Each structure stands twice: as structure tokens, then as C-alpha cells.
Design a protein around this ligand. Structure first.
Ligand SMILES: Nc1nc2c(ncn2[C@@H]2O[C@H](COP(=O)(O)O)[C@@H](O)[C@H]2O)c(=O)[nH]1
Ligand SMILES: Nc1nc2c(ncn2[C@@H]2O[C@H](COP(=O)(O)O)[C@@H](O)[C@H]2O)c(=O)[nH]1
Ligand SMILES: Nc1nc2c(ncn2[C@@H]2O[C@H](COP(=O)(O)O)[C@@H](O)[C@H]2O)c(=O)[nH]1
Ligand SMILES: Nc1nc2c(ncn2[C@@H]2O[C@H](COP(=O)(O)O)[C@@H](O)[C@H]2O)c(=O)[nH]1
Ligand SMILES: [Mn+2]
Ligand SMILES: [Mn+2]
Ligand SMILES: [Mn+2]
Ligand SMILES: [Mn+2]
Ligand SMILES: [Mn+2]
Ligand SMILES: [Mn+2]
Ligand SMILES: [Zn+2]
Ligand SMILES: [Zn+2]
Ligand SMILES: [Zn+2]
Ligand SMILES: [Zn+2]
Ligand SMILES: [Zn+2]
Ligand SMILES: [Zn+2]
Length: 332
């Protein structure tokens, strides 16, 4: 469960350690994947030189950080490509577009059995509301598992937002660099426990597998991708969503796309609300405070209150004391 967040990382930077890592991963049924690369000075959308490939599987409580820079891609691909090509081992990404491009351009591999969970989350939004926006990991984690992505406030994350520096070319990598890189794959695997194999999720995993497969075909072409599959970087192709996920949903109460019945303001406003006692749920014509005759009492025979409320709550007419007005010693 949330034990995933406590998986230690392990730097894989030698051939011995690489072979040991591959052994573990090969028994996996799912492997979360992510890539850290040199930042680019330019305006190209392509990831820079691959530095780390991070992997976290359900086969071992450990995050492997493959130092692809030290190992070299040739060493790394020779041991990893069969596993990356194994469609019986699910590969979990969070937004796979540029990562898959880099795997294709820089490593010459194209993964199989890929499932993009950002695309999964948007698929759920599309089915329920006809929303095709991509959400960041921060938003999705907080929304699905109530956790705060605190790595977005870390020094590493700001160093890239500045963009002045490759960042990921330093060797040896500082501890908070590695811990930062481990968190991304930890979040991906943790997230898959909420989305994959959950009967309360309104989209079939296989359908999102088929939609993701379109993204991999579009982005793994051995060259940089000039034409993007989506109209803007932060959304998912609506025609693909329509083909693979189905017609987009909307509000069964008012009719509008963009929200569900449970979010509809028109439902919560048009609700019956009492002009006399303020309570929501009844009009004033049926209010018990305004018309106490609608309540005969179970234990005393007075109109206005049930059995669950036969106590005297209003203080004395005469002195304000803890009793009723008729029995005040000033009038009696
Ligand atoms: N220049 C720049 N590069 C980024 C930024 N965010 C991510 N990247 C690049 O994308 C890679 C993967 O980041 P991720 O998609 O795993 O968050 C990083 O290693 C880095 O190369 C950013 O805000 N600015
Ligand atoms: N590579 C890349 N992805 C982006 C960019 N802007 C938005 N995204 C996508 O949208 C997600 C975050 O959404 P946003 O924070 O932009 O609403 C990112 O994780 C990524 O999948 C961008 O400029 N470059
Ligand atoms: N949650 C919600 N968002 C809306 C509604 N109408 C427009 N938007 C944006 C609504 O009824 N509910
Ligand atoms: N008809 C009526 N129902 C009420 C009133 N106050 C609370 N209720 C109902 O009793 C309980 C809630 O379900 C609420 O809807 C009222 O003044 N009139
Ligand atoms: Mn990534
Ligand atoms: Mn970023
Ligand atoms: Mn990352
Ligand atoms: Mn509205
Ligand atoms: Mn009431
Ligand atoms: Mn009335
Ligand atoms: Zn080897
Ligand atoms: Zn984390
Ligand atoms: Zn509505
Ligand atoms: Zn009322
Ligand atoms: Zn009573
Ligand atoms: Zn009194």
C-alpha cells in the first residue's frame, strides 16, 4: 500500500549491479518507469541526454536508479531491452510522450505493455465530464491518494525550473538528487494501486492500454517528433479519447459537459431551502418551526416537538434562571 513511499533507492552504475537489478525486475508484473535527462538550453521539446532511468517494480521493495550516463546506453540496452520489450510486464509511466521519444532516439528501444497513468486519469475525467486536461503528478496524488508531492518544493526541482544548467550531469549525484529521482517512480507505482484493478474506476485498463499504445506508436519513431499528438502539451487528443475510451460524459442533472451531477451547482442551489428556519430540505409551507402543529409530541401532548427534544432550552422570563417561567419564585 503506502509502504511504497518507503522503498530505498539503489544506484545501479556498474555491470555487476546492472545484472543483479535485471534479475529482480524480470519477475515483475508491473514496473514503474521514469527518466531524468540533461536540461536543454534551447527551445526544442526533446529531452536532453539521458542521465538516469528510474525503475520501481512490484517484485522488490527497492527503487533502481540506473546511471545510464556512467554505464552507457549500450551496456544498459543490452540487458534491459528484452524486459522492456516484454508485453507481459506492464510498464507504468506518468506522461510517457517525451520519455518514449528519448528511449527511441537515444537508446533505440520501443517499450511494449506500456500504460500511461496521467492518460489514465484524464481518461476518467473524459468519461465523466468530457474534460481532456492533463494533470500534474502533484494534483493527481493529492486527488487520488491525499498525499502532497513535496519534491516540487525541493532545491533540485527549482534548479531545473531555472533551466540554466544540465543539472543531471554531476557525478557523483548528491543524495537529494537521487532521493528526488526515486520519488517520481515511487509515486507512479503507488498510483497504479489506485487505478489498476479497482472496480470503482469507470474505465477499463485495457482501453487505456490501447490509448497509451497510440502514444507510443506516435512518439517512438527513431527520430525526434515534430508534430505532437495533442493540440497543446497539457491535454489528450479528443479523437483518440473518443475512439478508445468512448463518448465523453457530462452532468445528468443540468445537461452540461465539464462537471458531474455531484459537482453541479444547479443541483445544490435548486435544492429546497426553508425561508423561515434556513434549513435545507423543506419549504416553509412544511416547516416545523413555522407550523408546530405538524408535530405532536410522543410523551407530553404538546404541539411543536418530538420525543427526542422534550427539554426546556429557553431561560426564564423573569430572571433568566435555570428553569421555566411559570415556576419562577417571583410570580408563584
Ligand atoms: N528545462 C527544464 N527541464 C525539465 C523541467 N521539468 C522536467 N524537465 C526535464 O524532463 C526530465 C524528466 O522530468 P519528469 O518528466 O520526470 O518530471 C528532467 O530530467 C529534465 O530533463 C523543467 O521544468 N525545465
Ligand atoms: N513536456 C512538457 N509537458 C508539459 C508541459 N506543460 C504541461 N505538460 C504536461 O502537463 C503536466 C502538468 O500540467 P500543468 O501543470 O501544465 O497543468 C505535465 O506533467 C506534462 O505531462 C510542457 O511544457 N512540457
Ligand atoms: N463544479 C462545477 N463546475 C462548473 C459548473 N458549471 C461550470 N463549471 C466550470 C458546475 O455546475 N459545477
Ligand atoms: N418537513 C420538515 N422536515 C424537516 C424540518 N427540519 C428538519 N427536517 C428533516 O428532518 C431530518 C432531515 O431529513 C430534515 O430534512 C422541517 O422544518 N420540516
Ligand atoms: Mn517523467
Ligand atoms: Mn517539471
Ligand atoms: Mn522525474
Ligand atoms: Mn453551470
Ligand atoms: Mn428542522
Ligand atoms: Mn409558510
Ligand atoms: Zn551484460
Ligand atoms: Zn515522494
Ligand atoms: Zn450540472
Ligand atoms: Zn423550516
Ligand atoms: Zn414533549
Ligand atoms: Zn425565574
Amino acid at each position: 500500500s503506502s509502504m511504497i513511499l518507503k522503498y530505498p533507492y539503489r544506484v545501479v552504475d556498474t555491470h555487476e549491479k546492472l545484472k543483479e537489478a535485471v534479475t529482480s525486475l524480470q519477475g515483475a508484473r508491473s514496473i514503474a518507469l521514469d527518466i531524468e535527462a540533461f536540461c536543454t538550453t534551447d527551445q526544442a521539446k526533446q529531452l536532453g541526454r539521458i542521465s538516469l532511468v528510474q525503475a520501481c517494480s512490484d517484485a522488490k521493495p527497492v527503487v533502481f536508479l540506473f546511471d545510464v550516463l556512467t554505464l552507457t546506453p549500450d551496456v544498459f540496452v543490452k540487458d534491459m531491452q528484452s524486459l522492456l520489450s516484454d508485453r507481459e510486464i506492464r510498464k507504468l509511466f506518468f506522461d510517457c510522450r517525451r520519455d518514449v521519444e528519448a528511449l527511441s532516439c537515444q537508446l533505440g528501444v520501443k517499450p511494449e505493455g506500456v500504460l500511461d497513468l496521467q492518460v489514465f486519469f484524464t481518461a476518467i475525467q473524459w468519461k465523466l465530464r468530457s474534460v481532456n486536461r492533463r494533470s500534474g503528478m502533484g494534483y493527481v496524488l493529492k486527488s487520488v491518494a491525499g498525499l502532497t508531492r513535496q519534491e516540487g518544493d525541493s532545491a533540485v526541482q527549482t534548479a531545473m525550473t531555472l533551466g540554466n544548467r544540465p543539472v543531471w550531469d554531476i557525478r557523483p549525484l548528491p543524495d537529494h538528487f537521487l532521493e528526488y529521482a526515486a520519488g517520481d517512480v515511487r509515486h507512479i507505482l503507488l498510483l497504479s494501486n489506485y487505478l489498476v484493478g479497482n472496480k470503482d474506476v469507470p474505465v477499463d485498463v485495457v482501453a487505456v492500454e490501447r490509448l497509451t499504445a497510440q502514444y507510443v506508436e506516435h512518439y517512438a519513431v527513431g527520430k525526434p517528433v515534430i508534430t505532437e499528438a495533442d493540440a497543446t502539451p497539457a491535454e489528450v487528443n479528443r479523437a483518440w479519447l473518443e475512439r478508445y475510451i468512448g463518448p465523453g460524459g457530462g452532468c445528468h442533472f443540468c445537461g452540461a459537459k465539464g462537471h458531474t451531477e455531484a459537482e453541479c451547482f444547479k443541483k445544490q442551489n435548486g435544492k429546497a431551502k426553508c425561508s423561515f428556519c434556513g434549513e435545507v430540505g423543506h419549504t416553509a409551507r412544511n416547516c416545523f418551526k413555522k407550523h408546530p402543529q405538524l408535530l405532536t409530541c410522543e410523551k407530553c401532548g404538546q404541539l411543536g416537538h418530538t420525543g427526542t427534544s422534550c427539554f426546556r432550552t429557553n431561560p426564564c422570563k423573569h430572571c433568566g434562571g435555570p428553569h421555566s417561567s411559570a415556576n419562577c419564585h417571583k410570580v408563584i
